[PDB]
Design a protein around this ligand. Structure first.
Ligand SMILES: Nc1ncnc2c1ncn2[C@@H]1O[C@H](COP(=O)(O)OP(=O)(O)O)[C@@H](O)[C@H]1O
Length: 290
């Protein structure tokens, strides 16, 4: 089962919004890798675009290394540093219950990953548990961020001139975690990644969100029902029963102006001071490590 003379494939290990991911062997390097394949018959080619964004992100903490991109047989190919399980996988393994300590350990790192992407001029646009993966081996305690398939530039690399406040008619990424600005058809900016992470954190605390599992016939009526339930659930109701920092977080992100540089440090501190007041330490002992 070959991809040229370069890689052998072992098995399929995931399928994201486009293409498929295989665990494979990098023959030259003698190491396992994650190989993403997009069929060259695609009339909506995305992999090359995603590969360039991953190239631009290289070097950051918790960004997987891109090994090789090209075309082999019937596929466009992107080969990446192989990572461990996703937070969605780990959360389901933990029966959808994380300890406050694990939620805060994860928050600290997730905020930094998002910050890093923003430092490189992009909005992620698909912040969700499936898009954060733990490292392998000695890097088992480091949270990585993946899926740059929806990532879009928000400022000029030279000047830092922010994109104009403008409409965006698509609900692009996952509706469960989308920002209210996004539901209102406004272009996503740095605030919106952070608000989405707020919903991810509350999802980790609750096991599910109140707008999750609403049935509808059209895919646009499902989005409309999520949008309504999200807009009708105040942050204070959503976060009832958990430390106030979760609400403060969400309120801070909803209060950001479109072009505001978020105070990521403040947001990490909110959760860090909570974490220390609870008597935890940043030892990277997660719930799945016990
Ligand atoms: N580098 C990787 N190592 C291990 N698993 C991965 C890796 N990249 C993706 N996966 C798995 O495949 C799923 C889909 O990946 P995808 O959304 O297409 O990621 P990307 O676009 O970054 O390749 C992910 O949720 C994850 O479980």
């Amino acid at each position: 089962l070959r991809v040229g003379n370069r890689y052998r494939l072992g098995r399929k290990i995931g399928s994201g919004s486009f293409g498929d991911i295989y665990l494979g062997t990098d023959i030259a390097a003698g190491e396992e890798v994650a190989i993403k394949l997009e069929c060259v018959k695609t009339k909506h080619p995305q992999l090359h675009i995603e590969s360039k964004i991953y190239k631009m992100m290289q070097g950051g903490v918790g960004i997987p290394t891109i090994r090789w991109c090209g075309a082999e047989g019937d596929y466009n190919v992107m080969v990446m540093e192989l990572l461990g399980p996703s937070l969605e996988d780990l959360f389901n393994f933990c029966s959808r219950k994380f300890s406050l300590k694990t939620v805060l350990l994860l928050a600290d790192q997730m905020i930094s990953r998002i910050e890093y992407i923003h430092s490189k001029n992009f909005i992620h646009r698909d912040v969700k548990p499936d898009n954060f993966l733990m490292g392998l081996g000695k890097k088992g305690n480091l949270v990585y961020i993946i899926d740059f398939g929806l990532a879009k530039k928000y400022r000029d690399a030279r000047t830092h001139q922010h994109i104009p406040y403008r409409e965006n008619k698509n609900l692009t990424g996952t509706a469960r975690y989308a920002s209210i600005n996004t539901h209102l058809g406004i272009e996503q900016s740095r605030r919106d990644d952070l608000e989405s992470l707020g919903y991810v954190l509350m999802y980790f605390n609750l096991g599910s969100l109140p707008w999750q599992g609403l049935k509808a016939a059209t895919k646009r009526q499902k989005y409309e029902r999520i949008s309504e339930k999200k807009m009708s659930t105040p942050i204070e109701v959503l976060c009832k029963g958990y430390p106030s920092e979760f609400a403060t977080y969400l309120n801070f992100c909803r209060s950001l102006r479109f072009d505001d540089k978020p105070d990521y440090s403040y947001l990490r501190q909110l959760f860090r001071n909570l974490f220390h007041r609870q008597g935890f330490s940043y030892d990277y002992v997660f719930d799945w490590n016990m």
